[PDB]
mmCIF file of C-alpha atoms in Angstrom:
data_model
loop_
_atom_site.group_PDB
_atom_site.id
_atom_site.type_symbol
_atom_site.label_atom_id
_atom_site.label_comp_id
_atom_site.label_asym_id
_atom_site.label_seq_id
_atom_site.Cartn_x
_atom_site.Cartn_y
_atom_site.Cartn_z
ATOM 1 C CA UNK A 1 0.000 0.000 0.000
ATOM 2 C CA UNK A 2 1.057 3.647 -0.265
ATOM 3 C CA UNK A 3 -0.096 6.694 1.592
ATOM 4 C CA UNK A 4 -1.517 6.668 5.082
ATOM 5 C CA UNK A 5 -4.162 9.301 5.964
ATOM 6 C CA UNK A 6 -5.431 8.447 9.462
ATOM 7 C CA UNK A 7 -6.780 4.863 9.116
ATOM 8 C CA UNK A 8 -6.988 5.112 5.294
ATOM 9 C CA UNK A 9 -4.475 3.814 2.774
ATOM 10 C CA UNK A 10 -4.140 3.674 -0.956
ATOM 11 C CA UNK A 11 -3.826 0.138 -2.242
ATOM 12 C CA UNK A 12 -1.546 -0.116 -5.292
ATOM 13 C CA UNK A 13 -4.563 -0.300 -7.684
ATOM 14 C CA UNK A 14 -6.163 2.726 -5.934
ATOM 15 C CA UNK A 15 -2.892 4.664 -6.406
ATOM 16 C CA UNK A 16 -2.993 3.831 -10.141
ATOM 17 C CA UNK A 17 -6.585 5.293 -10.151
ATOM 18 C CA UNK A 18 -5.435 8.485 -8.406
ATOM 19 C CA UNK A 19 -2.885 9.195 -11.159
ATOM 20 C CA UNK A 20 -3.575 10.516 -14.651
ATOM 21 C CA UNK A 21 -2.182 8.473 -17.570
ATOM 22 C CA UNK A 22 0.878 9.746 -19.442
ATOM 23 C CA UNK A 23 1.260 13.116 -17.746
ATOM 24 C CA UNK A 24 4.261 12.789 -15.401
ATOM 25 C CA UNK A 25 7.793 12.281 -16.718
ATOM 26 C CA UNK A 26 8.689 10.769 -13.356
ATOM 27 C CA UNK A 27 7.363 9.684 -9.992
ATOM 28 C CA UNK A 28 9.788 9.800 -7.077
ATOM 29 C CA UNK A 29 8.622 7.768 -4.094
ATOM 30 C CA UNK A 30 9.928 9.150 -0.788
ATOM 31 C CA UNK A 31 8.431 6.095 0.881
ATOM 32 C CA UNK A 32 9.538 2.610 1.908
ATOM 33 C CA UNK A 33 9.300 -0.422 -0.343
ATOM 34 C CA UNK A 34 7.973 1.159 -3.539
ATOM 35 C CA UNK A 35 10.695 -0.159 -5.911
ATOM 36 C CA UNK A 36 8.660 -3.330 -6.343
ATOM 37 C CA UNK A 37 8.323 -4.883 -9.819
ATOM 38 C CA UNK A 38 4.578 -5.226 -9.229
ATOM 39 C CA UNK A 39 4.188 -1.547 -8.266
ATOM 40 C CA UNK A 40 6.257 -0.284 -11.211
ATOM 41 C CA UNK A 41 4.157 -2.494 -13.527
ATOM 42 C CA UNK A 42 0.858 -1.210 -12.001
ATOM 43 C CA UNK A 43 2.088 2.390 -12.570
ATOM 44 C CA UNK A 44 3.727 1.779 -15.988
ATOM 45 C CA UNK A 45 1.407 4.227 -17.807
ATOM 46 C CA UNK A 46 1.668 6.902 -15.052
ATOM 47 C CA UNK A 47 5.283 7.977 -15.677
ATOM 48 C CA UNK A 48 8.273 7.395 -17.941
ATOM 49 C CA UNK A 49 10.516 6.827 -14.900
ATOM 50 C CA UNK A 50 9.986 5.615 -11.346
ATOM 51 C CA UNK A 51 12.691 6.534 -8.809
ATOM 52 C CA UNK A 52 12.220 4.609 -5.564
ATOM 53 C CA UNK A 53 13.675 2.414 -2.828
ATOM 54 C CA UNK A 54 13.147 -1.330 -2.725
ATOM 55 C CA UNK A 55 13.711 -1.348 1.078
ATOM 56 C CA UNK A 56 13.028 1.093 3.911
ATOM 57 C CA UNK A 57 14.283 4.650 3.894
ATOM 58 C CA UNK A 58 15.329 6.552 7.044
ATOM 59 C CA UNK A 59 12.729 9.025 8.438
ATOM 60 C CA UNK A 60 14.781 12.060 7.269
ATOM 61 C CA UNK A 61 13.843 10.984 3.744
ATOM 62 C CA UNK A 62 15.385 12.237 0.536
ATOM 63 C CA UNK A 63 17.983 15.105 0.529
ATOM 64 C CA UNK A 64 15.741 17.780 -1.029
ATOM 65 C CA UNK A 65 18.224 20.629 -0.569
ATOM 66 C CA UNK A 66 20.924 18.906 -2.639
ATOM 67 C CA UNK A 67 18.513 17.321 -5.130
ATOM 68 C CA UNK A 68 16.690 20.529 -5.969
ATOM 69 C CA UNK A 69 18.881 21.861 -8.779
ATOM 70 C CA UNK A 70 19.091 18.338 -10.274
ATOM 71 C CA UNK A 71 15.285 17.893 -10.250
ATOM 72 C CA UNK A 72 14.791 21.243 -12.058
ATOM 73 C CA UNK A 73 17.807 21.021 -14.393
ATOM 74 C CA UNK A 74 17.199 21.611 -18.112
ATOM 75 C CA UNK A 75 18.899 18.229 -18.736
ATOM 76 C CA UNK A 76 17.080 16.181 -16.127
ATOM 77 C CA UNK A 77 19.056 13.046 -15.231
ATOM 78 C CA UNK A 78 17.185 11.041 -12.596
ATOM 79 C CA UNK A 79 20.200 8.756 -12.145
ATOM 80 C CA UNK A 80 21.992 11.857 -10.698
ATOM 81 C CA UNK A 81 19.116 12.467 -8.293
ATOM 82 C CA UNK A 82 19.219 8.805 -7.222
ATOM 83 C CA UNK A 83 23.029 9.100 -6.766
ATOM 84 C CA UNK A 84 22.569 12.232 -4.604
ATOM 85 C CA UNK A 85 20.212 10.235 -2.346
ATOM 86 C CA UNK A 86 22.615 7.269 -2.138
ATOM 87 C CA UNK A 87 25.720 9.437 -1.576
ATOM 88 C CA UNK A 88 23.827 11.339 1.166
ATOM 89 C CA UNK A 89 23.102 8.151 3.109
ATOM 90 C CA UNK A 90 26.472 6.598 2.448
ATOM 91 C CA UNK A 91 27.905 9.592 4.407
ATOM 92 C CA UNK A 92 25.145 9.748 7.094
ATOM 93 C CA UNK A 93 25.160 8.624 10.767
ATOM 94 C CA UNK A 94 22.688 5.877 9.671
ATOM 95 C CA UNK A 95 24.224 4.774 6.344
ATOM 96 C CA UNK A 96 21.251 2.695 5.189
ATOM 97 C CA UNK A 97 19.706 3.315 1.778
ATOM 98 C CA UNK A 98 18.657 1.528 -1.423
ATOM 99 C CA UNK A 99 17.608 3.133 -4.668
ATOM 100 C CA UNK A 100 16.632 2.234 -8.203
ATOM 101 C CA UNK A 101 15.408 3.962 -11.350
ATOM 102 C CA UNK A 102 12.911 2.059 -13.530
ATOM 103 C CA UNK A 103 12.236 2.992 -17.182
ATOM 104 C CA UNK A 104 8.577 2.114 -17.640
ATOM 105 C CA UNK A 105 8.695 1.811 -21.488
ATOM 106 C CA UNK A 106 10.769 -1.369 -20.936
ATOM 107 C CA UNK A 107 8.327 -3.011 -18.506
ATOM 108 C CA UNK A 108 6.162 -4.689 -21.166
ATOM 109 C CA UNK A 109 9.258 -6.493 -22.539
ATOM 110 C CA UNK A 110 10.305 -7.464 -18.999
ATOM 111 C CA UNK A 111 6.751 -8.747 -18.357
ATOM 112 C CA UNK A 112 7.024 -10.989 -21.411
ATOM 113 C CA UNK A 113 10.388 -12.378 -20.234
ATOM 114 C CA UNK A 114 8.889 -13.112 -16.803
ATOM 115 C CA UNK A 115 5.627 -14.544 -18.228
ATOM 116 C CA UNK A 116 7.621 -16.990 -20.297
ATOM 117 C CA UNK A 117 9.237 -18.277 -17.057
ATOM 118 C CA UNK A 118 6.350 -18.168 -14.548
ATOM 119 C CA UNK A 119 3.172 -18.875 -16.541
ATOM 120 C CA UNK A 120 3.793 -22.641 -16.567
ATOM 121 C CA UNK A 121 4.967 -22.830 -12.916
ATOM 122 C CA UNK A 122 2.795 -24.576 -10.343
ATOM 123 C CA UNK A 123 2.362 -24.031 -6.610
ATOM 124 C CA UNK A 124 4.616 -27.088 -6.137
ATOM 125 C CA UNK A 125 7.375 -25.452 -8.209
ATOM 126 C CA UNK A 126 7.186 -22.168 -6.353
ATOM 127 C CA UNK A 127 6.736 -23.618 -2.852
ATOM 128 C CA UNK A 128 9.782 -25.859 -3.444
ATOM 129 C CA UNK A 129 12.013 -22.755 -3.240
ATOM 130 C CA UNK A 130 13.898 -22.211 0.013
ATOM 131 C CA UNK A 131 13.650 -18.501 1.000
ATOM 132 C CA UNK A 132 17.050 -18.834 2.703
ATOM 133 C CA UNK A 133 18.653 -19.042 -0.803
ATOM 134 C CA UNK A 134 17.327 -15.549 -1.832
ATOM 135 C CA UNK A 135 17.990 -12.045 -0.559
ATOM 136 C CA UNK A 136 15.135 -10.954 1.725
ATOM 137 C CA UNK A 137 14.401 -7.227 1.360
ATOM 138 C CA UNK A 138 11.475 -6.700 3.729
ATOM 139 C CA UNK A 139 11.015 -7.079 7.451
ATOM 140 C CA UNK A 140 7.581 -5.691 8.270
ATOM 141 C CA UNK A 141 6.138 -6.373 11.712
ATOM 142 C CA UNK A 142 5.103 -10.081 12.051
ATOM 143 C CA UNK A 143 6.103 -10.765 8.435
ATOM 144 C CA UNK A 144 7.675 -14.148 7.694
ATOM 145 C CA UNK A 145 9.418 -12.510 4.641
ATOM 146 C CA UNK A 146 7.355 -11.793 1.548
ATOM 147 C CA UNK A 147 9.438 -9.461 -0.602
ATOM 148 C CA UNK A 148 12.725 -10.744 -2.009
ATOM 149 C CA UNK A 149 15.212 -9.613 -4.561
ATOM 150 C CA UNK A 150 13.529 -9.961 -8.018
ATOM 151 C CA UNK A 151 16.667 -11.357 -9.710
ATOM 152 C CA UNK A 152 17.199 -13.917 -6.950
ATOM 153 C CA UNK A 153 13.675 -15.355 -7.298
ATOM 154 C CA UNK A 154 13.747 -15.526 -11.084
ATOM 155 C CA UNK A 155 17.239 -17.095 -11.062
ATOM 156 C CA UNK A 156 15.808 -19.974 -8.990
ATOM 157 C CA UNK A 157 13.058 -20.720 -11.568
ATOM 158 C CA UNK A 158 14.508 -19.815 -14.973
ATOM 159 C CA UNK A 159 16.389 -22.069 -17.357
ATOM 160 C CA UNK A 160 19.806 -20.642 -18.402
ATOM 161 C CA UNK A 161 18.353 -19.318 -21.674
ATOM 162 C CA UNK A 162 15.369 -17.808 -19.946
ATOM 163 C CA UNK A 163 17.639 -16.220 -17.369
ATOM 164 C CA UNK A 164 19.886 -14.596 -20.017
ATOM 165 C CA UNK A 165 16.789 -13.093 -21.677
ATOM 166 C CA UNK A 166 15.532 -11.894 -18.300
ATOM 167 C CA UNK A 167 18.869 -10.167 -17.506
ATOM 168 C CA UNK A 168 18.878 -8.378 -20.895
ATOM 169 C CA UNK A 169 15.314 -7.123 -20.247
ATOM 170 C CA UNK A 170 16.040 -6.293 -16.587
ATOM 171 C CA UNK A 171 19.027 -4.120 -17.548
ATOM 172 C CA UNK A 172 16.885 -2.154 -20.008
ATOM 173 C CA UNK A 173 14.217 -1.564 -17.302
ATOM 174 C CA UNK A 174 16.392 -0.915 -14.215
ATOM 175 C CA UNK A 175 18.717 1.737 -15.634
ATOM 176 C CA UNK A 176 20.293 2.796 -12.320
ATOM 177 C CA UNK A 177 20.570 1.181 -8.894
ATOM 178 C CA UNK A 178 22.655 1.521 -5.735
ATOM 179 C CA UNK A 179 22.699 0.172 -2.215
ATOM 180 C CA UNK A 180 24.532 0.771 0.983
ATOM 181 C CA UNK A 181 26.147 -2.359 2.548
ATOM 182 C CA UNK A 182 23.175 -2.774 4.916
ATOM 183 C CA UNK A 183 19.547 -1.751 4.952
ATOM 184 C CA UNK A 184 17.719 -0.777 8.164
ATOM 185 C CA UNK A 185 14.335 -2.248 9.126
ATOM 186 C CA UNK A 186 12.201 -0.428 11.694
ATOM 187 C CA UNK A 187 10.296 -3.463 12.970
ATOM 188 C CA UNK A 188 13.506 -5.316 13.943
ATOM 189 C CA UNK A 189 15.422 -2.194 15.017
ATOM 190 C CA UNK A 190 18.462 -3.354 13.084
ATOM 191 C CA UNK A 191 20.284 -3.154 9.778
ATOM 192 C CA UNK A 192 20.999 -6.313 7.778
ATOM 193 C CA UNK A 193 23.427 -6.974 4.871
ATOM 194 C CA UNK A 194 22.454 -6.814 1.244
ATOM 195 C CA UNK A 195 24.391 -9.629 -0.534
ATOM 196 C CA UNK A 196 22.430 -9.633 -3.859
ATOM 197 C CA UNK A 197 20.726 -6.570 -5.310
ATOM 198 C CA UNK A 198 18.938 -5.819 -8.605
ATOM 199 C CA UNK A 199 16.972 -2.725 -7.485
ATOM 200 C CA UNK A 200 13.484 -4.289 -7.403
ATOM 201 C CA UNK A 201 11.618 -6.608 -5.122
ATOM 202 C CA UNK A 202 9.071 -9.298 -5.983
ATOM 203 C CA UNK A 203 6.540 -11.253 -3.960
ATOM 204 C CA UNK A 204 7.691 -14.831 -3.341
ATOM 205 C CA UNK A 205 4.521 -16.880 -2.843
ATOM 206 C CA UNK A 206 4.903 -19.294 0.043
ATOM 207 C CA UNK A 207 2.887 -22.207 1.290
ATOM 208 C CA UNK A 208 2.278 -20.479 4.701
ATOM 209 C CA UNK A 209 0.695 -17.389 3.012
ATOM 210 C CA UNK A 210 -2.369 -18.573 1.014
ATOM 211 C CA UNK A 211 -4.478 -15.491 1.892
ATOM 212 C CA UNK A 212 -1.687 -13.170 0.714
ATOM 213 C CA UNK A 213 -1.497 -15.033 -2.619
ATOM 214 C CA UNK A 214 -5.311 -14.841 -3.065
ATOM 215 C CA UNK A 215 -5.223 -11.075 -2.567
ATOM 216 C CA UNK A 216 -2.230 -10.704 -4.906
ATOM 217 C CA UNK A 217 -4.090 -12.678 -7.614
ATOM 218 C CA UNK A 218 -7.186 -10.487 -7.361
ATOM 219 C CA UNK A 219 -5.620 -7.062 -6.879
ATOM 220 C CA UNK A 220 -2.080 -6.898 -8.291
ATOM 221 C CA UNK A 221 -2.031 -6.709 -12.126
ATOM 222 C CA UNK A 222 1.418 -8.374 -12.317
ATOM 223 C CA UNK A 223 -0.061 -11.694 -11.168
ATOM 224 C CA UNK A 224 -2.392 -12.204 -14.166
ATOM 225 C CA UNK A 225 0.260 -10.649 -16.447
ATOM 226 C CA UNK A 226 3.007 -13.193 -15.649
ATOM 227 C CA UNK A 227 1.464 -16.268 -13.921
ATOM 228 C CA UNK A 228 -1.470 -16.770 -16.320
ATOM 229 C CA UNK B 3 -5.663 32.840 -14.120
ATOM 230 C CA UNK B 4 -2.925 30.177 -14.887
ATOM 231 C CA UNK B 5 0.784 30.971 -14.604
ATOM 232 C CA UNK B 6 2.727 31.172 -17.894
ATOM 233 C CA UNK B 7 3.778 27.711 -19.042
ATOM 234 C CA UNK B 8 7.275 26.906 -17.801
ATOM 235 C CA UNK B 9 9.842 24.178 -18.367
ATOM 236 C CA UNK B 10 8.911 22.028 -15.354
ATOM 237 C CA UNK B 11 6.361 21.769 -12.536
ATOM 238 C CA UNK B 12 7.012 19.382 -9.685
ATOM 239 C CA UNK B 13 4.291 18.540 -7.177
ATOM 240 C CA UNK B 14 5.224 17.046 -3.800
ATOM 241 C CA UNK B 15 2.167 15.213 -2.424
ATOM 242 C CA UNK B 16 2.791 14.742 1.299
ATOM 243 C CA UNK B 17 0.524 12.354 3.245
ATOM 244 C CA UNK B 18 1.749 13.066 6.743
ATOM 245 C CA UNK B 19 -1.454 12.441 8.840
ATOM 246 C CA UNK B 20 0.392 9.496 10.399
ATOM 247 C CA UNK B 21 3.714 8.813 12.312
ATOM 248 C CA UNK B 22 5.864 10.749 9.799
ATOM 249 C CA UNK B 23 4.086 14.019 10.838
ATOM 250 C CA UNK B 24 7.176 15.407 12.647
ATOM 251 C CA UNK B 25 9.474 14.659 9.672
ATOM 252 C CA UNK B 26 7.295 16.340 7.017
ATOM 253 C CA UNK B 27 8.261 19.781 8.346
ATOM 254 C CA UNK B 28 12.025 18.909 8.237
ATOM 255 C CA UNK B 29 11.663 17.766 4.604
ATOM 256 C CA UNK B 30 9.835 20.991 3.640
ATOM 257 C CA UNK B 31 12.592 23.063 5.286
ATOM 258 C CA UNK B 32 15.134 21.072 3.215
ATOM 259 C CA UNK B 33 13.149 21.941 0.053
ATOM 260 C CA UNK B 34 13.155 25.620 1.142
ATOM 261 C CA UNK B 35 16.978 25.554 1.470
ATOM 262 C CA UNK B 36 17.284 24.142 -2.071
ATOM 263 C CA UNK B 37 14.526 26.058 -3.883
ATOM 264 C CA UNK B 38 16.418 29.217 -4.867
ATOM 265 C CA UNK B 39 15.505 31.029 -8.167
ATOM 266 C CA UNK B 40 18.774 29.705 -9.648
ATOM 267 C CA UNK B 41 18.063 26.109 -8.574
ATOM 268 C CA UNK B 42 14.393 26.115 -9.695
ATOM 269 C CA UNK B 43 15.628 27.214 -13.152
ATOM 270 C CA UNK B 44 12.241 28.811 -13.952
ATOM 271 C CA UNK B 45 10.239 25.799 -12.755
ATOM 272 C CA UNK B 46 7.428 25.572 -10.195
ATOM 273 C CA UNK B 47 7.701 23.716 -6.874
ATOM 274 C CA UNK B 48 4.272 23.030 -5.462
ATOM 275 C CA UNK B 49 3.588 21.133 -2.224
ATOM 276 C CA UNK B 50 0.317 19.506 -1.132
ATOM 277 C CA UNK B 51 0.833 19.150 2.605
ATOM 278 C CA UNK B 52 -1.546 16.946 4.661
ATOM 279 C CA UNK B 53 -0.260 16.821 8.278
ATOM 280 C CA UNK B 54 -1.769 15.311 11.432
ATOM 281 C CA UNK B 55 -3.133 18.220 13.493
ATOM 282 C CA UNK B 56 -4.750 20.422 10.810
ATOM 283 C CA UNK B 57 -6.401 20.424 7.374
ATOM 284 C CA UNK B 58 -4.373 20.079 4.190
ATOM 285 C CA UNK B 59 -2.782 23.004 2.404
ATOM 286 C CA UNK B 60 -1.379 23.774 -0.995
ATOM 287 C CA UNK B 61 1.939 25.692 -0.956
ATOM 288 C CA UNK B 62 4.296 27.172 -3.550
ATOM 289 C CA UNK B 63 7.975 27.343 -2.618
ATOM 290 C CA UNK B 64 9.734 30.260 -4.331
ATOM 291 C CA UNK B 65 12.437 32.829 -3.769
ATOM 292 C CA UNK B 66 11.503 36.517 -3.551
ATOM 293 C CA UNK B 67 13.855 39.294 -2.522
ATOM 294 C CA UNK B 68 16.638 36.841 -1.611
ATOM 295 C CA UNK B 69 14.500 34.625 0.685
ATOM 296 C CA UNK B 70 12.897 31.289 -0.262
ATOM 297 C CA UNK B 71 9.315 31.470 1.104
ATOM 298 C CA UNK B 72 6.442 29.017 1.612
ATOM 299 C CA UNK B 73 3.580 30.790 -0.140
ATOM 300 C CA UNK B 74 0.112 29.764 0.958
ATOM 301 C CA UNK B 75 -2.040 28.974 -2.105
ATOM 302 C CA UNK B 76 -5.054 27.453 -0.378
ATOM 303 C CA UNK B 77 -6.420 25.680 2.648
ATOM 304 C CA UNK B 78 -8.521 22.595 2.062
ATOM 305 C CA UNK B 79 -11.282 21.420 4.340
ATOM 306 C CA UNK B 80 -10.748 18.106 6.091
ATOM 307 C CA UNK B 81 -10.427 15.428 3.367
ATOM 308 C CA UNK B 82 -9.073 11.964 2.799
ATOM 309 C CA UNK B 83 -5.770 12.530 0.970
ATOM 310 C CA UNK B 84 -5.555 8.748 0.298
ATOM 311 C CA UNK B 85 -8.841 8.856 -1.700
ATOM 312 C CA UNK B 86 -7.805 8.597 -5.409
ATOM 313 C CA UNK B 87 -10.496 11.154 -6.315
ATOM 314 C CA UNK B 88 -8.887 13.683 -3.930
ATOM 315 C CA UNK B 89 -5.406 12.978 -5.336
ATOM 316 C CA UNK B 90 -6.676 13.383 -8.939
ATOM 317 C CA UNK B 91 -8.415 16.632 -8.039
ATOM 318 C CA UNK B 92 -5.286 18.110 -6.365
ATOM 319 C CA UNK B 93 -3.112 17.056 -9.289
ATOM 320 C CA UNK B 94 -5.622 18.669 -11.659
ATOM 321 C CA UNK B 95 -5.660 21.945 -9.693
ATOM 322 C CA UNK B 96 -1.850 22.074 -9.766
ATOM 323 C CA UNK B 97 -1.390 21.181 -13.446
ATOM 324 C CA UNK B 98 -4.101 23.662 -14.454
ATOM 325 C CA UNK B 99 -2.604 26.578 -12.545
ATOM 326 C CA UNK B 100 1.139 25.718 -13.098
ATOM 327 C CA UNK B 101 1.304 24.392 -16.672
ATOM 328 C CA UNK B 102 4.667 23.080 -17.882
ATOM 329 C CA UNK B 103 6.493 21.232 -20.623
ATOM 330 C CA UNK B 104 7.257 18.465 -18.162
ATOM 331 C CA UNK B 105 5.874 17.324 -14.843
ATOM 332 C CA UNK B 106 7.287 15.433 -11.897
ATOM 333 C CA UNK B 107 5.552 13.955 -8.885
ATOM 334 C CA UNK B 108 7.091 13.284 -5.500
ATOM 335 C CA UNK B 109 4.893 10.857 -3.525
ATOM 336 C CA UNK B 110 5.750 11.191 0.154
ATOM 337 C CA UNK B 111 4.274 8.929 2.820
ATOM 338 C CA UNK B 112 4.509 5.473 4.324
ATOM 339 C CA UNK B 113 4.803 2.655 1.820
ATOM 340 C CA UNK B 114 4.543 -1.135 1.780
ATOM 341 C CA UNK B 115 4.944 -1.944 -1.963
ATOM 342 C CA UNK B 116 1.793 -3.763 -3.308
ATOM 343 C CA UNK B 117 0.901 -5.178 0.090
ATOM 344 C CA UNK B 118 -2.677 -4.874 1.257
ATOM 345 C CA UNK B 119 -2.926 -2.298 4.080
ATOM 346 C CA UNK B 120 -4.513 -5.038 6.255
ATOM 347 C CA UNK B 121 -1.657 -7.531 5.507
ATOM 348 C CA UNK B 122 -1.292 -8.379 9.216
ATOM 349 C CA UNK B 123 -4.604 -10.234 8.961
ATOM 350 C CA UNK B 124 -3.458 -12.331 5.959
ATOM 351 C CA UNK B 125 -0.402 -14.020 7.600
ATOM 352 C CA UNK B 126 -1.960 -17.418 8.699
#
């Protein structure tokens, strides 16, 4: 979800409804967890570029003072803005930050590469994966671990040929990424290492989370796009 | 009475009626430090600010006489900033009054990717 107003939140499909099509050049999420392949896909017609963090961001947020001339530059380069964010946190008391820049025009091709891997996969195939072999990128309160590194998940399921195609498409879509050595998670009060990093998270369906999968099927466009 | 079309308008949509309330003000002050005439490069910096203890407001951040100011554009009545209709309406007001060749959106709030807001109830 995105955006808390009292008790009310925007679900990812509601956020897509709150945004006009093909108006914004970019959306910058100063918010945790928004560099999610599903979220970027849901918002693919809402911007040309999505600049966001796949993990949590410190409360101080993005370095607006330093970013300002970059955001308003005649030759806007969002990779520079992302680098300003990263370099700020790298040199901060709490050096914990992840960032990625997604080029939405390349998401349809990436979807096809992922569809060709996941559409024939069964619950048995997916539930056979051991989460311990993939980089976890989310530690929400009471979560058993739902969001993992996108590359790590796909690498576990793809044939070598499929994987090569995926990497070619991934590199066209994720045009810039950076991470500090560790990422900090509020619910655990600790920072944990990032050993594998592509810039985007994905849901890893697990046998203990059938209700989460049912909701994802019904409400997250990516599911029907790549699993069916 | 729209402003002359400029090179860029950026809208910062701040949903801060939550635990980030205290940090929204710090982020706005950071924007004020950066938003000089030279740095804005003719562009518009507009902020929709929805904090905890008061109704939302629309602000323009712009330098005048050597000082970057928060200029009050309007006060909204109490409204759900997470309602997509409200977001669309604010975006429309901003784009209409501050036309540009290019637009950017900063979405500022809590986030949990695609997860349902009631995810804690879907863990068993």
